[PDB]
Ligand binder design. Structure first.
Ligand code: N51
Length: 320
């Protein structure tokens, strides 16, 4: 009984479009392998309703899905069933962060991107897909799950969907955006309830990350491979997003058990080691890897990707 209602018409078009894409794909054979043409494909749909469903949906809108075979294969390699994906994005409206949304069940992130971001996604997409194949989906890179263009009421936006780095169930009381460039959160920024700390806050507030030698060695090797892939694509300015769940604070502040998570859903979680001074769960992965060339060149009004990756790896290596 979904109607795709929301106060925001763009969200309705997004919900209707994801519903439509996934149902369309159920009428398209799963190929043995992706072929080059699948990486320049799209589907466009233009809808003009007259005096029909005039309360749930805008009457005039356009929905375009980029490379739908590829994003279907990607979801599959990331362990995501299309019907579940469909349910997560349509059973109830995505929630704003208060320009990014989460699905109502907190599984996926929905971000508005620019058209140069869409062009850069297409430039790295074959290489990205091959890398996901070769690492069997085990990576700290963002998991790109679908990419769309929406048009309603004379407004056009591009959006991309990725897996949430944070738990869909375990709450996060402290997050950092770490780069190795330094980077301090504003006084305004620390006024929020859920501020995004940065490199210098991580150091100055004495933050420790209590994971055992094995988990740390496994994470750093994954990180080094992922960041070397980014350096070859000449990408930079990405961050490590670090979310900390405090078990004891989650309990005092309100069928899986205390501090436990499903590593098949919250794929970035790492438990603290048995002798940590505080019971904690960490969620860590790489975010925001696209260049944003023109957005940043009009923002102004040097470090290369090789250098960037090495500062990055050295900083993360030092704080784990
Ligand atoms: C306890 N009490 C409150 C009751 C609980 C209520 C409750 O359950 N609500 C709730 C819970 C969790 C949240 C939440 O999880 N918030 C959050 C905040 C910052 C970052 C991220 N993750 C991200 C970001 C990006 C990302 C960055 N930049 C990008 C550029 C392009 C593409 C993607 C990206 N990617 C992947 N994960 C998630 C929101 C609401």
């Amino acid at each position: 009984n979904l109607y795709f209602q929301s106060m925001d018409p763009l969200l309705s078009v997004l919900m209707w479009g994801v519903n439509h894409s996934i149902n369309e794909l159920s009428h398209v054979q799963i190929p043995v392998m992706l072929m080059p043409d699948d990486f320049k494909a799209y589907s466009k749909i233009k809808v003009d309703n007259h005096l029909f469903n005039k309360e749930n949906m805008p009457s005039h809108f356009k929905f375009k899905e980029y490379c739908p075979m590829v994003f279907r294969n990607l979801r599959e390699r990331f362990g995501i069933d299309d019907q579940d994906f469909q349910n997560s994005l349509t059973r109830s409206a995505p929630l704003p962060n208060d320009r990014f949304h989460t699905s109502y069940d907190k599984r996926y992130i929905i971000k508005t991107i620019t058209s140069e971001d869409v062009a850069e996604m297409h430039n790295i997409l074959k290489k990205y897909h091959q890398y996901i194949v070769e690492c069997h989906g085990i990576t700290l890179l963002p998991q790109f799950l679908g990419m769309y263009r929406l048009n309603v009421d004379g407004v056009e936006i591009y959006v991309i969907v990725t897996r949430n780095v944070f738990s869909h169930r375990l709450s996060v009381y402290r997050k950092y955006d770490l780069k190795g460039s330094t980077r301090e959160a504003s006084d305004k920024e620390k006024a929020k309830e859920l501020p995004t700390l940065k490199d210098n806050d991580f150091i100055n507030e004495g933050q420790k990350i209590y994971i055992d030698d094995n988990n740390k060695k496994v994470f750093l090797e994954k990180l080094k491979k992922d960041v070397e892939f980014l350096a070859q694509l000449k990408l930079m300015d990405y961050s490590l997003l670090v979310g900390i769940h405090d078990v004891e604070r989650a309990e005092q502040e309100e069928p899986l058990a205390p501090g436990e998570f499903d590593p098949n859903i919250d794929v970035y979680g790492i438990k603290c080691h048995e002798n940590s001074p505080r019971k904690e769960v960490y969620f860590m992965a790489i975010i925001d890897i696209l260049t944003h060339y023109d957005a940043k060149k009009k923002a102004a009004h040097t470090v290369n990707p090789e250098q960037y990756s090495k500062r990055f790896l050295d900083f993360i290596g030092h704080i784990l």
